[PDB]
mmCIF file with all atom_site columns, C-alpha atoms in Angstrom:
data_model
loop_
_atom_site.group_PDB
_atom_site.id
_atom_site.type_symbol
_atom_site.label_atom_id
_atom_site.label_alt_id
_atom_site.label_comp_id
_atom_site.label_asym_id
_atom_site.label_entity_id
_atom_site.label_seq_id
_atom_site.pdbx_PDB_ins_code
_atom_site.Cartn_x
_atom_site.Cartn_y
_atom_site.Cartn_z
_atom_site.occupancy
_atom_site.B_iso_or_equiv
_atom_site.pdbx_formal_charge
_atom_site.auth_seq_id
_atom_site.auth_comp_id
_atom_site.auth_asym_id
_atom_site.auth_atom_id
_atom_site.pdbx_PDB_model_num
ATOM 1   C CA . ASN A 1 1  ? -6.073  25.090 87.010  1.00 0.00 ? 424 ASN A CA 1
ATOM 2   C CA . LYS A 1 2  ? -7.877  26.055 90.216  1.00 0.00 ? 425 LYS A CA 1
ATOM 3   C CA . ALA A 1 3  ? -5.059  26.038 92.759  1.00 0.00 ? 426 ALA A CA 1
ATOM 4   C CA . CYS A 1 4  ? -2.963  28.846 91.282  1.00 0.00 ? 427 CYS A CA 1
ATOM 5   C CA . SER A 1 5  ? -5.699  31.446 90.770  1.00 0.00 ? 428 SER A CA 1
ATOM 6   C CA . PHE A 1 6  ? -6.374  31.397 94.527  1.00 0.00 ? 429 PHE A CA 1
ATOM 7   C CA . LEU A 1 7  ? -3.005  33.001 95.203  1.00 0.00 ? 430 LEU A CA 1
ATOM 8   C CA . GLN A 1 8  ? -3.108  35.786 92.592  1.00 0.00 ? 431 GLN A CA 1
ATOM 9   C CA . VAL A 1 9  ? -6.175  37.317 94.253  1.00 0.00 ? 432 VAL A CA 1
ATOM 10  C CA . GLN A 1 10 ? -4.195  38.109 97.390  1.00 0.00 ? 433 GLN A CA 1
ATOM 11  C CA . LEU A 1 11 ? -1.218  38.873 95.148  1.00 0.00 ? 434 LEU A CA 1
ATOM 12  C CA . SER A 1 12 ? -2.557  41.138 92.374  1.00 0.00 ? 435 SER A CA 1
ATOM 13  C CA . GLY A 1 13 ? -3.654  44.100 94.446  1.00 0.00 ? 436 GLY A CA 1
ATOM 14  C CA . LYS A 1 14 ? -4.608  43.451 98.061  1.00 0.00 ? 437 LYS A CA 1
ATOM 15  C CA . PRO A 1 15 ? -4.488  40.378 100.368 1.00 0.00 ? 438 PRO A CA 1
ATOM 16  C CA . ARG A 1 16 ? -7.173  38.270 102.087 1.00 0.00 ? 439 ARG A CA 1
ATOM 17  C CA . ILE A 1 17 ? -7.226  40.318 105.290 1.00 0.00 ? 440 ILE A CA 1
ATOM 18  C CA . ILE A 1 18 ? -7.581  43.696 103.603 1.00 0.00 ? 441 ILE A CA 1
ATOM 19  C CA . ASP A 1 19 ? -10.222 42.222 101.316 1.00 0.00 ? 442 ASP A CA 1
ATOM 20  C CA . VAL A 1 20 ? -12.399 40.462 103.906 1.00 0.00 ? 443 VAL A CA 1
ATOM 21  C CA . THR A 1 21 ? -11.980 42.511 107.078 1.00 0.00 ? 444 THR A CA 1
ATOM 22  C CA . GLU A 1 22 ? -12.827 45.869 105.468 1.00 0.00 ? 445 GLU A CA 1
ATOM 23  C CA . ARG A 1 23 ? -16.444 44.778 105.083 1.00 0.00 ? 446 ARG A CA 1
ATOM 24  C CA . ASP A 1 24 ? -16.817 44.140 108.789 1.00 0.00 ? 447 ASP A CA 1
ATOM 25  C CA . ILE A 1 25 ? -15.708 47.721 109.179 1.00 0.00 ? 448 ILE A CA 1
ATOM 26  C CA . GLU A 1 26 ? -18.310 48.830 106.651 1.00 0.00 ? 449 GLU A CA 1
ATOM 27  C CA . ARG A 1 27 ? -21.251 46.428 106.523 1.00 0.00 ? 450 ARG A CA 1
ATOM 28  C CA . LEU A 1 28 ? -21.824 46.218 110.268 1.00 0.00 ? 451 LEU A CA 1
ATOM 29  C CA . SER A 1 29 ? -21.515 50.001 110.543 1.00 0.00 ? 452 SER A CA 1
ATOM 30  C CA . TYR A 1 30 ? -23.970 50.186 107.645 1.00 0.00 ? 453 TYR A CA 1
ATOM 31  C CA . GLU A 1 31 ? -26.550 48.654 109.986 1.00 0.00 ? 454 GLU A CA 1
ATOM 32  C CA . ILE A 1 32 ? -25.949 50.495 113.256 1.00 0.00 ? 455 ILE A CA 1
ATOM 33  C CA . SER A 1 33 ? -26.000 53.926 111.593 1.00 0.00 ? 456 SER A CA 1
ATOM 34  C CA . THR A 1 34 ? -29.735 53.786 110.881 1.00 0.00 ? 457 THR A CA 1
ATOM 35  C CA . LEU A 1 35 ? -30.448 52.795 114.507 1.00 0.00 ? 458 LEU A CA 1
ATOM 36  C CA . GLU A 1 36 ? -31.378 56.245 115.762 1.00 0.00 ? 459 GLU A CA 1
ATOM 37  C CA . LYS A 1 37 ? -34.148 55.941 118.371 1.00 0.00 ? 460 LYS A CA 1
ATOM 38  C CA . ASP A 1 38 ? -33.916 52.603 120.202 1.00 0.00 ? 461 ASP A CA 1
ATOM 39  C CA . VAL A 1 39 ? -35.423 53.130 123.636 1.00 0.00 ? 462 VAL A CA 1
ATOM 40  C CA . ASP A 1 40 ? -37.041 49.753 122.855 1.00 0.00 ? 463 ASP A CA 1
ATOM 41  C CA . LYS A 1 41 ? -35.887 46.582 124.623 1.00 0.00 ? 464 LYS A CA 1
ATOM 42  C CA . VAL A 1 42 ? -33.497 43.642 123.993 1.00 0.00 ? 465 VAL A CA 1
ATOM 43  C CA . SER A 1 43 ? -32.205 44.951 120.631 1.00 0.00 ? 466 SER A CA 1
ATOM 44  C CA . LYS A 1 44 ? -30.267 47.219 123.031 1.00 0.00 ? 467 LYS A CA 1
ATOM 45  C CA . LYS A 1 45 ? -28.129 44.115 123.689 1.00 0.00 ? 468 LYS A CA 1
ATOM 46  C CA . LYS A 1 46 ? -27.246 43.907 119.996 1.00 0.00 ? 469 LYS A CA 1
ATOM 47  C CA . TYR A 1 47 ? -25.442 47.224 120.402 1.00 0.00 ? 470 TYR A CA 1
ATOM 48  C CA . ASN A 1 48 ? -23.505 45.464 123.198 1.00 0.00 ? 471 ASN A CA 1
ATOM 49  C CA . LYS A 1 49 ? -22.550 42.803 120.635 1.00 0.00 ? 472 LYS A CA 1
ATOM 50  C CA . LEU A 1 50 ? -22.116 44.578 117.299 1.00 0.00 ? 473 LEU A CA 1
ATOM 51  C CA . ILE A 1 51 ? -20.295 47.610 118.701 1.00 0.00 ? 474 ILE A CA 1
ATOM 52  C CA . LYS A 1 52 ? -18.255 45.158 120.747 1.00 0.00 ? 475 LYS A CA 1
ATOM 53  C CA . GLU A 1 53 ? -17.653 43.263 117.509 1.00 0.00 ? 476 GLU A CA 1
ATOM 54  C CA . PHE A 1 54 ? -15.938 46.430 116.266 1.00 0.00 ? 477 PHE A CA 1
ATOM 55  C CA . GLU A 1 55 ? -13.679 46.172 119.309 1.00 0.00 ? 478 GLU A CA 1
ATOM 56  C CA . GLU A 1 56 ? -13.370 42.500 118.374 1.00 0.00 ? 479 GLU A CA 1
ATOM 57  C CA . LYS A 1 57 ? -12.395 43.482 114.835 1.00 0.00 ? 480 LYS A CA 1
ATOM 58  C CA . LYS A 1 58 ? -10.373 46.676 115.343 1.00 0.00 ? 481 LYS A CA 1
ATOM 59  C CA . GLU A 1 59 ? -8.138  45.121 117.989 1.00 0.00 ? 482 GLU A CA 1
ATOM 60  C CA . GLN A 1 60 ? -7.427  42.352 115.484 1.00 0.00 ? 483 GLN A CA 1
ATOM 61  C CA . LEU A 1 61 ? -7.205  44.881 112.628 1.00 0.00 ? 484 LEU A CA 1
ATOM 62  C CA . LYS B 2 1  ? -68.404 56.141 119.047 1.00 0.00 ? 485 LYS B CA 1
ATOM 63  C CA . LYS B 2 2  ? -65.388 54.383 120.544 1.00 0.00 ? 486 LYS B CA 1
ATOM 64  C CA . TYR B 2 3  ? -63.531 53.766 117.283 1.00 0.00 ? 487 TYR B CA 1
ATOM 65  C CA . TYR B 2 4  ? -63.390 57.302 115.948 1.00 0.00 ? 488 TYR B CA 1
ATOM 66  C CA . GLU B 2 5  ? -62.260 58.544 119.347 1.00 0.00 ? 489 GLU B CA 1
ATOM 67  C CA . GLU B 2 6  ? -59.533 55.917 119.232 1.00 0.00 ? 490 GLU B CA 1
ATOM 68  C CA . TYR B 2 7  ? -58.606 57.327 115.833 1.00 0.00 ? 491 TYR B CA 1
ATOM 69  C CA . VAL B 2 8  ? -58.400 60.730 117.522 1.00 0.00 ? 492 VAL B CA 1
ATOM 70  C CA . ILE B 2 9  ? -56.113 59.618 120.352 1.00 0.00 ? 493 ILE B CA 1
ATOM 71  C CA . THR B 2 10 ? -53.793 57.567 118.156 1.00 0.00 ? 494 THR B CA 1
ATOM 72  C CA . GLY B 2 11 ? -53.982 60.334 115.563 1.00 0.00 ? 495 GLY B CA 1
ATOM 73  C CA . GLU B 2 12 ? -53.046 62.986 118.121 1.00 0.00 ? 496 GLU B CA 1
ATOM 74  C CA . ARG B 2 13 ? -49.902 61.016 119.015 1.00 0.00 ? 497 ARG B CA 1
ATOM 75  C CA . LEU B 2 14 ? -48.329 61.237 115.553 1.00 0.00 ? 498 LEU B CA 1
ATOM 76  C CA . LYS B 2 15 ? -48.971 64.974 115.344 1.00 0.00 ? 499 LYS B CA 1
ATOM 77  C CA . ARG B 2 16 ? -47.100 65.282 118.640 1.00 0.00 ? 500 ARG B CA 1
ATOM 78  C CA . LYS B 2 17 ? -44.394 62.910 117.431 1.00 0.00 ? 501 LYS B CA 1
ATOM 79  C CA . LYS B 2 18 ? -43.498 64.794 114.237 1.00 0.00 ? 502 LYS B CA 1
ATOM 80  C CA . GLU B 2 19 ? -43.271 67.972 116.317 1.00 0.00 ? 503 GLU B CA 1
ATOM 81  C CA . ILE B 2 20 ? -40.561 66.259 118.371 1.00 0.00 ? 504 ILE B CA 1
ATOM 82  C CA . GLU B 2 21 ? -39.142 63.575 116.061 1.00 0.00 ? 505 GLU B CA 1
ATOM 83  C CA . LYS B 2 22 ? -37.889 66.424 113.876 1.00 0.00 ? 506 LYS B CA 1
ATOM 84  C CA . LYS B 2 23 ? -36.463 68.365 116.824 1.00 0.00 ? 507 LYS B CA 1
ATOM 85  C CA . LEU B 2 24 ? -34.523 65.359 118.102 1.00 0.00 ? 508 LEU B CA 1
ATOM 86  C CA . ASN B 2 25 ? -32.997 64.660 114.690 1.00 0.00 ? 509 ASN B CA 1
ATOM 87  C CA . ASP B 2 26 ? -31.864 68.270 114.234 1.00 0.00 ? 510 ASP B CA 1
ATOM 88  C CA . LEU B 2 27 ? -30.292 69.196 117.579 1.00 0.00 ? 511 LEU B CA 1
ATOM 89  C CA . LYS B 2 28 ? -28.345 65.936 117.890 1.00 0.00 ? 512 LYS B CA 1
ATOM 90  C CA . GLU B 2 29 ? -26.522 66.481 114.587 1.00 0.00 ? 513 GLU B CA 1
ATOM 91  C CA . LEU B 2 30 ? -25.158 69.784 115.871 1.00 0.00 ? 514 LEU B CA 1
ATOM 92  C CA . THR B 2 31 ? -23.744 67.818 118.829 1.00 0.00 ? 515 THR B CA 1
ATOM 93  C CA . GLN B 2 32 ? -22.427 64.923 116.732 1.00 0.00 ? 516 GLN B CA 1
ATOM 94  C CA . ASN B 2 33 ? -19.371 66.412 115.029 1.00 0.00 ? 517 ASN B CA 1
ATOM 95  C CA . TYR B 2 34 ? -16.800 68.937 116.256 1.00 0.00 ? 518 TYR B CA 1
ATOM 96  C CA . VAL B 2 35 ? -19.165 71.689 117.457 1.00 0.00 ? 519 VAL B CA 1
ATOM 97  C CA . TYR B 2 36 ? -19.158 70.319 121.028 1.00 0.00 ? 520 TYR B CA 1
ATOM 98  C CA . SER B 2 37 ? -15.427 71.087 121.455 1.00 0.00 ? 521 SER B CA 1
ATOM 99  C CA . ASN B 2 38 ? -15.968 73.875 124.007 1.00 0.00 ? 522 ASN B CA 1
ATOM 100 C CA . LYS B 2 39 ? -19.681 74.050 125.053 1.00 0.00 ? 523 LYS B CA 1
ATOM 101 C CA . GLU B 2 40 ? -20.867 75.590 121.771 1.00 0.00 ? 524 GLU B CA 1
ATOM 102 C CA . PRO B 2 41 ? -23.907 73.352 122.070 1.00 0.00 ? 525 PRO B CA 1
ATOM 103 C CA . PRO B 2 42 ? -24.027 74.185 125.802 1.00 0.00 ? 526 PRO B CA 1
ATOM 104 C CA . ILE B 2 43 ? -25.596 72.380 128.755 1.00 0.00 ? 527 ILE B CA 1
ATOM 105 C CA . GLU B 2 44 ? -28.883 74.215 128.122 1.00 0.00 ? 528 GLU B CA 1
ATOM 106 C CA . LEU B 2 45 ? -29.055 72.681 124.644 1.00 0.00 ? 529 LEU B CA 1
ATOM 107 C CA . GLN B 2 46 ? -27.758 69.332 125.898 1.00 0.00 ? 530 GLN B CA 1
ATOM 108 C CA . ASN B 2 47 ? -30.565 69.241 128.469 1.00 0.00 ? 531 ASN B CA 1
ATOM 109 C CA . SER B 2 48 ? -33.166 70.083 125.811 1.00 0.00 ? 532 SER B CA 1
ATOM 110 C CA . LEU B 2 49 ? -32.066 66.886 124.077 1.00 0.00 ? 533 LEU B CA 1
ATOM 111 C CA . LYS B 2 50 ? -32.808 64.997 127.291 1.00 0.00 ? 534 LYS B CA 1
ATOM 112 C CA . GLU B 2 51 ? -36.038 66.964 127.791 1.00 0.00 ? 535 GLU B CA 1
ATOM 113 C CA . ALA B 2 52 ? -37.734 65.632 124.665 1.00 0.00 ? 536 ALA B CA 1
ATOM 114 C CA . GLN B 2 53 ? -36.279 62.147 125.196 1.00 0.00 ? 537 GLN B CA 1
ATOM 115 C CA . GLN B 2 54 ? -37.803 61.945 128.684 1.00 0.00 ? 538 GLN B CA 1
ATOM 116 C CA . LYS B 2 55 ? -41.108 62.793 127.012 1.00 0.00 ? 539 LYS B CA 1
ATOM 117 C CA . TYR B 2 56 ? -40.631 59.624 124.942 1.00 0.00 ? 540 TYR B CA 1
ATOM 118 C CA . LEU B 2 57 ? -39.062 57.400 127.523 1.00 0.00 ? 541 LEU B CA 1
ATOM 119 C CA . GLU B 2 58 ? -42.728 56.847 128.448 1.00 0.00 ? 542 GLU B CA 1
ATOM 120 C CA . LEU B 2 59 ? -45.059 58.052 125.682 1.00 0.00 ? 543 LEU B CA 1
ATOM 121 C CA . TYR B 2 60 ? -43.254 56.083 122.999 1.00 0.00 ? 544 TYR B CA 1
#
């Protein structure tokens, strides 16, 4: 009973990629958008990861 | 006599922050979307962004 319902989720509507990868568009950008004034230290480097994760995602997208 | 004066100095910071934390959040949003096509927020306004930020490169 389990093995068939896995395939309809990608089938009825949208696939696994469209489902999963759209959140890493949204949910990561949900976090960076509040980050207005960050003259503070090493959390600067998390820009240099999470914005570069967009380049990691959107090249794959 | 030390503690109240420390409440003055730390209190006088936040008065001077809200004077400038509002002005940073306004003038950037003019420069965020489609107004900066041809210098309509010109270099004088783009330097005034950097003017208040250089006040809080240190004081923040």
